[PDB]
């Protein structure tokens, strides 16, 4: 009855849960905005996932209150870079940190 643990690459926060659908992604964007954090989108080649510096997609979405626009930009970033990993972050200016960061598409 013991089950063997199957090893695979992971992608930091939320990567131990099933990948997020639109509804789950929207809920995270809404959270970040409610905390006063600025959403941002980044992408990178799969092999370079551990890079500290991923490519920025456009600029962070400062003052952005519209969850659907952020999700649309995630999808647009995917379309522009269909083989890349795509990450959502949320900048916290007071902490000089990220309140949230997770990989939306794990790459291919």
């Amino acid at each position: 009855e013991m089950q063997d643990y199957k090893q695979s690459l992971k992608y930091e926060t939320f990567s131990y849960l099933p990948p997020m659908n639109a509804e789950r992604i929207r809920a995270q964007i809404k959270y970040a905005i409610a905390q006063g954090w600025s959403p941002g989108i980044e992408h990178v080649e799969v092999k370079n996932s551990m890079n500290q510096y991923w490519y920025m997609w456009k600029l962070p979405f400062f003052g952005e209150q519209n969850v659907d626009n952020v999700l649309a930009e995630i999808e647009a970033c995917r379309s522009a870079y269909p083989t890349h990993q795509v990450k959502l972050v949320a900048y916290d200016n007071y902490a000089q940190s990220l309140g949230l960061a997770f990989v939306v598409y794990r790459g291919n």
């Binding site: 089950q3 131990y16 809920a27 940190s97």
Partner: protein
């Protein structure tokens, strides 16, 4: 000469709050004055050399007495000490001056140091955390959740290579960190250089297979400073990102040196509080853990064990939450309900990760996430190593539980109220979590 109820403390003064349980009949003001004297000048009777000095300036002064709510046999004495009584950048000197002799005072039944106000001008002279929470998150590339760790057991008898095997299996399953026990230094069954080498191999192997940064708190607590620094240097040499020190048993001089070295060499510093309960448990005699928390933040560490909060009853948690704020926040206002006797300003000195450890398992996850929030390290020993499918599976169960609680929290759910449902739903996608839940469910007969 030491009871000065009209004295207004200066913003540069160090302040102390002592709970004094006097011998019945001893005048409160006299006892307060006596504690001020012993902790500054030591004496009441003038000798000729005193008259060579500015006696009005160079003394502690007791400036306020209060009742202790609920305890008629004790009172609080508030004492102010000019900043110049102390060596700068020296928790050793501040501590020695305040607590070196006064706890033996025969006119009290007990003395408890409850809190110490370190003025900003003194805080700026201390090195503080080598990195602190936000820099550590940047260096490890970890955001949006508490960090997860595990202490390897048994504490005795494993070879370096076998110990490394345990480390490897925990890390590959999803823990961010593993930890040396406080008692693991260099023993015949596992010499430190071998431990460091096999642990670093384990760390590198798990990091490669997960694509997440890993570390292991390699204990550099040692017989002498030379040995401590040699062990720290070797960790740096081999690429280990984090080391550990037992700050109370190795001691404050050693700790402060090591923290400066870590700041200078980019190595993170996990602090274990071994022996704290010898000093901090008795409510009428000793030094409250909140003082030891301030001392560590100034001496320096990037993580500090704080207690788990969940291990106390609901009405008994406030003091713990108070010292967690003292450890992490920039400014902590006075709040007697939480045992904070003075406003404490840290200015720009970074905060330190609060480490929850001791008897916790997956069912505590909702409460831990709710109470500690993201800037915490949650350590699961028995709760990882005791998983029926082994350490990788154990780690993965804790990681899934953690991530499910964080996602739910972010969605706006009341995760303590809905904890069982949140965990149950996550367990439908994680066999490892499902059986972990079975393993540690409290069975009531």
């Amino acid at each position: 000469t030491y009871w000065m109820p009209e004295y207004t403390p200066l913003d540069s003064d160090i302040l102390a709050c002592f709970k004094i349980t006097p011998q019945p009949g001893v005048d409160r003001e006299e006892a307060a004055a006596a504690v001020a004297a012993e902790s500054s000048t030591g004496t009441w009777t003038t000798v000729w050399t005193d008259l060579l000095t500015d006696m009005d300036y160079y003394k502690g002064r007791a400036y306020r007495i209060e009742d202790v709510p609920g305890d008629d046999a004790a009172f609080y004495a508030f004492i102010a000490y000019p900043i110049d009584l102390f060596e700068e950048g020296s928790v050793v000197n501040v501590f020695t001056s305040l607590v070196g002799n006064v706890f033996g005072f025969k006119a009290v039944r007990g003395l408890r140091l409850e809190d110490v106000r370190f003025p900003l001008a003194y805080v700026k002279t201390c090195g503080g955390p080598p990195h602190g929470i936000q820099v550590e998150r940047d260096k490890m590339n970890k955001y949006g959740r508490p960090l997860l760790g595990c202490t390897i057991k048994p504490k005795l008898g494993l070879s370096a290579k076998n110990y490394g095997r345990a480390v490897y299996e925990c890390l590959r399953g999803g823990l961010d960190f593993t930890k040396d026990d406080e008692n693991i230094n260099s023993q015949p069954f596992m010499r430190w250089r071998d431990r460091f080498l096999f642990v670093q191999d384990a760390t590198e192997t798990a990091e490669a297979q997960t694509g997440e940064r890993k570390g292991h708190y390699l204990n550099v607590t040692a017989p002498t400073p030379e040995e401590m620094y040699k062990r720290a240097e070797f960790a740096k040499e081999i690429g280990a990102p984090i080391i550990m020190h037992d700050y109370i048993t190795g001691g404050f001089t050693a700790n402060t040196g090591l923290a400066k070295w870590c700041q200078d060499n980019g190595v993170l510093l996990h602090i274990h509080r071994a022996m704290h309960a010898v000093i901090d448990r008795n409510p009428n005699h000793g030094i409250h853990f909140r003082v030891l928390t301030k001392i560590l933040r100034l001496s320096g560490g990037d993580h500090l064990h704080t207690g788990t909060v969940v291990g106390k009853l609901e009405g008994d948690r406030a003091s713990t939450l108070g010292w967690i704020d003292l450890l992490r926040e920039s400014f902590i206002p006075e709040d007697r309900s939480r045992g904070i006797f003075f406003d404490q300003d840290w200015g720009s000195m970074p905060g330190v990760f609060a480490v929850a450890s001791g008897g916790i398992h997956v069912w505590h996850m909702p409460a831990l996430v709710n109470i500690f929030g993201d800037d915490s390290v949650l350590q699961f020993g028995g709760g990882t190593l005791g998983h029926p499918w082994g350490n990788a599976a154990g780690a993965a169960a804790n990681r899934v539980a953690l991530e499910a609680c964080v996602e739910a929290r972010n969605q706006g759910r009341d995760i303590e109220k809905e904890g069982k449902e949140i965990l149950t739903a996550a367990a439908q996608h994680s066999p490892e979590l499902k059986i972990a839940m079975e393993t540690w469910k409290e069975i009531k007969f």
